C-alpha cells in the first residue's frame, strides 16, 4: 500500500503580532493645501501695518 501524503511540518508561526502603517492613501481631503485656510488671509502685507 502506498504511503499516505499529508502535511507534517507545523510551519513557523512567529509569536506576538506585526504592524501595518494604516495611513490614508492620498490624503487629498481632511487637509487643506496652505491656501483657502479659513480664518487667515495669506494675501496680507507683514505686520508693519500697525507700525
Amino acid at each position: 500500500k502506498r504511503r499516505p501524503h499529508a502535511q507534517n511540518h507545523a510551519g513557523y508561526k512567529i509569536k506576538y503580532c506585526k504592524q501595518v502603517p494604516l495611513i490614508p492613501l492620498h490624503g487629498g481631503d481632511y487637509i487643506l493645501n496652505h491656501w483657502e485656510t479659513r480664518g487667515v488671509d495669506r494675501m496680507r502685507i507683514p505686520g508693519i501695518q500697525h507700525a
Binding site: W35, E36, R42, M43, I45
Partner: protein, 51 residues
C-alpha cells in the same frame, strides 16, 4: 446736525386725527461711507494686502 422746528413740534403728540404726529415720535441717525480697496489675484487665491 441741527434739528428742525417741525421735528421739535412733532416730537410730542397733540396732533388731530390722521395727522401722524398725534403720538410721540423718535428719530435715529444713520451714516454710511463708501471707500476703495485693493484685491490681489494670484497663486489661486485672493486677499487684501492693506485690509
Amino acid at each position: 446736525v441741527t434739528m428742525s422746528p417741525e421735528s421739535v413740534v412733532a416730537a410730542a403728540g397733540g396732533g388731530n386725527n390722521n395727522s401722524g404726529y398725534n403720538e410721540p415720535q423718535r428719530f435715529a441717525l444713520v451714516v454710511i461711507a463708501v471707500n476703495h480697496n485693493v484685491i490681489r489675484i494670484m497663486n489661486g487665491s485672493m486677499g487684501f494686502p492693506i485690509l
